[PDB]
Design a binder for this molecule. Structure first.
Ligand SMILES: Cc1cc2nc3c(=O)[nH]c(=O)nc-3n(C[C@H](O)[C@H](O)[C@H](O)COP(=O)(O)OP(=O)(O)OC[C@H]3O[C@@H](n4cnc5c(N)ncnc54)[C@H](O)[C@@H]3O)c2cc1C
Ligand SMILES: Cc1cc2nc3c(=O)[nH]c(=O)nc-3n(C[C@H](O)[C@H](O)[C@H](O)COP(=O)(O)OP(=O)(O)OC[C@H]3O[C@@H](n4cnc5c(N)ncnc54)[C@H](O)[C@@H]3O)c2cc1C
Ligand SMILES: [Zn+2]
Ligand SMILES: [Zn+2]
Lengths: 230, 230
């Protein structure tokens, strides 16, 4: 039996470092005989906005619009916007979901945040109860491949940006673990733009090299302790 | 003299607790005689995607598109998209910037993240020489008024979601403090949808009552210690 992988890619330039890290992941996982799918958000012109346009049926409460309530109802009625269900198909089938993106304000670019806001709706990604360890997407693995402008030193506890794990909290714990995902150690390619042609090559290579044994990896303990120590 | 306030509002329903919190802020601050501008992102159908459309005219390098470089250059060249420059005018003129938004995946809704990604460009909000305490928007006050689905106990250090100060990090420190903003204590209205009408009123009331003395407030020490330490 093989493995299915969904790569949610968020970058505008194919020739970029992120483009390379995404292409390299495609190459390597393809080479492994893995089933690979790529959601090139910018090319898809993915709708980041959570609006009533995401529902197609009779709103549960057309007097007072509540996105969460409405999307959960739409999901259960199969009346969500198609672009959302398409993504949910990709995720539903994936064994691993990789997010390739540059760090935008200690987080993911808006287009990617929209992906998370709209795709990971109630009923599909989680239920109440049914989150964190009980997340509907339990059994799946998720990994953040992040490129940064700041340096590794800047992202240390005593660095000006604080520990790199600090900003991973909302994405890894708040979003992924909440949905049931098991989180693999993040792949951070620090300050590519500052790096030399050689160092860049090494960063790209290291990612491919790591993917060779990605199926053997254990997930990180997605806890407050892992992120903040104490 | 006088105090200018820019409220960046991100919610789809006017009749919502979020709308009420925004309306109350408008009321109170307008009553105080302050200058108030509101950016109703959803009504404005604000563009969250960071693309090459954000630059008008000839790109510094159309062969390889680099958002950060292109925008920064376009800023100095006065070639940015009007929707971005409009918001920058409001920001530049404001003394206090209030962000009113529901918590979406331990962060801000994508439409609001988009505002931050595109509006707070290099050359305007920050630049290599100036960031954090030296940010280009140094002197202004910033406040995050967020509503949560989770209860106050869930947002404790040993709670499922962890301490609320953990998710605040990328927002307050990574974004706001980075741009030079003085950060005022965040206003967090825990689980409004779960609260009673009495509790909700108490919530909206404390917010307005707080607004009565906002100008006398001391900004919090936006440090790693403040968010994670003891
Ligand atoms: C709105 C915004 C917010 C930001 N917020 C932050 C923040 O909070 N924190 C932070 O640290 N940074 C931040 N930055 C910076 C951002 O994280 C970096 O600019 C980004 O990660 C750089 O990645 P890139 O793929 O765009 O790089 P590139 O500019 O592509 O840099 C890579 C260089 O390598 C070349 N290259 C590409 N592929 C390869 C390859 N395979 N081998 C060799 N060379 C190659 C490229 O052509 C280029 O010369 C922000 C920037 C913006 C626009
Ligand atoms: C994509 C997505 C991701 C999410 N991620 C998170 C997350 O990470 N963490 C988390 O905890 N939650 C999350 N939520 C949930 C969300 O944060 C909350 O449900 C939301 O903040 C509730 O605020 P509201 O203003 O929309 O509430 P409302 O639906 O408006 O609830 C307020 C209630 O008070 C009534 N009301 C309005 N005005 C007043 C007034 N003045 N006085 C009295 N009553 C009034 C309203 O009509 C309603 O009955 C997420 C939701 C979505 C859709
Ligand atoms: Zn976790
Ligand atoms: Zn800070």
């Amino acid at each position: 039996a093989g493995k299915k992988v969904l790569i949610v890619y968020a970058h505008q330039e194919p020739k970029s470092f992120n483009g390379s890290l995404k292409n390299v992941a495609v190459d390597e996982l393809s080479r492994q005989g893995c089933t690979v799918t790529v959601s090139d958000l910018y090319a898809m012109n993915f709708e980041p906005r959570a609006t009533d346009k995401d529902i197609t049926g009779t709103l549960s409460n057309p007097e007072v619009f509540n996105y969460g309530v409405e999307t959960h109802e739409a999901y259960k009625q199969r009346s969500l916007a198609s672009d959302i269900t398409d993504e949910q198909k990709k995720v539903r089938e994936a064994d691993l979901v990789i997010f390739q993106f540059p760090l935008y304000w200690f987080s993911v670019p808006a287009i990617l945040k929209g992906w998370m806001d709209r795709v990971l709706c109630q009923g599909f990604a989680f239920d109440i109860p049914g989150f964190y360890d009980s997340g509907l997407l339990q059994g799946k693995l998720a990994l953040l491949s992040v490129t940064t402008g700041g340096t590794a030193e800047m992202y240390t506890k005593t660095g000006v940006n604080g520990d790199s794990r600090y900003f991973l909290w909302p994405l890894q714990h708040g979003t992924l673990h909440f949905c049931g995902f098991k989180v693999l150690a993040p792949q951070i390619s620090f300050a590519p733009e500052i790096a030399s042609e050689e160092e860049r090559k090494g960063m790209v290579a290291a990612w491919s090299q790591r993917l060779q044994t990605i199926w053997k990896e254990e997930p990180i303990p997605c806890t407050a302790h892992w992120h903040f120590g104490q």
